[PDB]
Design an enzyme around this catalytic site. Sequence first.
Site, PDB file in Angstrom:
ATOM      1  N   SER A   1     -71.313  46.046  -9.769  1.00 33.01           N
ATOM      2  CA  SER A   1     -70.061  45.901 -10.525  1.00 33.01           C
ATOM      3  C   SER A   1     -69.934  47.027 -11.531  1.00 33.01           C
ATOM      4  O   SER A   1     -69.986  48.192 -11.106  1.00 33.01           O
ATOM      5  CB  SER A   1     -69.964  44.501 -11.118  1.00 33.01           C
TER       6      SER A   1
ATOM      7  N   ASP B   1     -63.232  40.114  -3.121  1.00 40.30           N
ATOM      8  CA  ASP B   1     -63.531  40.442  -4.494  1.00 40.30           C
ATOM      9  C   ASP B   1     -62.271  40.505  -5.313  1.00 40.30           C
ATOM     10  O   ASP B   1     -61.452  41.367  -5.058  1.00 40.30           O
ATOM     11  CB  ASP B   1     -64.368  41.767  -4.484  1.00 40.30           C
TER      12      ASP B   1
ATOM     13  N   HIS C   1     -67.125  38.721  -5.381  1.00 37.65           N
ATOM     14  CA  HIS C   1     -67.738  39.702  -6.303  1.00 37.65           C
ATOM     15  C   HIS C   1     -69.175  39.408  -6.590  1.00 37.65           C
ATOM     16  O   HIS C   1     -69.925  40.293  -6.940  1.00 37.65           O
ATOM     17  CB  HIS C   1     -66.917  39.712  -7.577  1.00 37.65           C
TER      18      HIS C   1
END
Length: 261
Positions: A130, A176, A208
């Site tokens: 991320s 996501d 995600h």
Amino acid sequence: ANPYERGPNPTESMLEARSGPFSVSEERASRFGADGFGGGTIYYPRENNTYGAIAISPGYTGTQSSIAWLGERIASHGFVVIAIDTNTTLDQPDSRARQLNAALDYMLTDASSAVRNRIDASRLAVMGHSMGGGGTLRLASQRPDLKAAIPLTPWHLNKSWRDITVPTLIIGAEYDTIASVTLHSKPFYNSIPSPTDKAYLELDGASHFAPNITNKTIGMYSVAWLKRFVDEDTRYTQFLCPGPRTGLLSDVEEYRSTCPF
Ligand SMILES: CCOC(=O)[C@@H](C)O
Ligand SMILES: [Ca+2]
Ligand SMILES: [Ca+2]
Ligand SMILES: [Ca+2]
Ligand code: NA
Ligand code: NA
């Protein structure tokens, strides 16, 4: 013979298993002894040899525990891996990049002799989830000496990584909603210039947070990428070229690469 080759000849089964062929030990880098990052846990093979060294960053709100499974998993295939904590859990991508660089430097000269004696300092890579995957892209852009980079569901405001020359595997998640592949992973992958070796792997059905729990596809392809590029191990090319089957029933929604490498 490749001086960097480690471990038994691979199979898909071996790569998807919960643990590779090497036994893993741990060394804890405290926040207060770690210059430039928040500390972490270094996972390394018990077997004495030299191995490549990898640093992995969490994302926003995350800590080392959010990526520890993967740090351990990778070390169990013959790598020295630090799963870091950041200075604060709210640090932004480019701060994450600096902290990944500090964690690589920490393994090379500040860790124990047990860790340092197991590292070939010339063969390094970086990964992250991320915002930590955004940090991975940035460090890869600034450090062309790195052997590989693996951004996992990466998030960054900068969409064009036109200066990355490090072999980069970007793993995205189909569903996501935080770092949408439309806005993040794909633009990033598309922007990495020719002739840089690269691949894009989109996890079917995934959110995600797929990188934060044990995931056979992330483990298999992260190890195969590191083996191929950090260890110049061509025994792993078979998994990457032509790569996973995609299509309606696959765990891989889509796969792109610059095979053959
Ligand atoms: C566990 C880390 O979570 C994230 O990085 C999200 C908030 O992007
Ligand atoms: Ca162990
Ligand atoms: Ca520190
Ligand atoms: Ca799908
Ligand atoms: Na997406
Ligand atoms: Na993304």
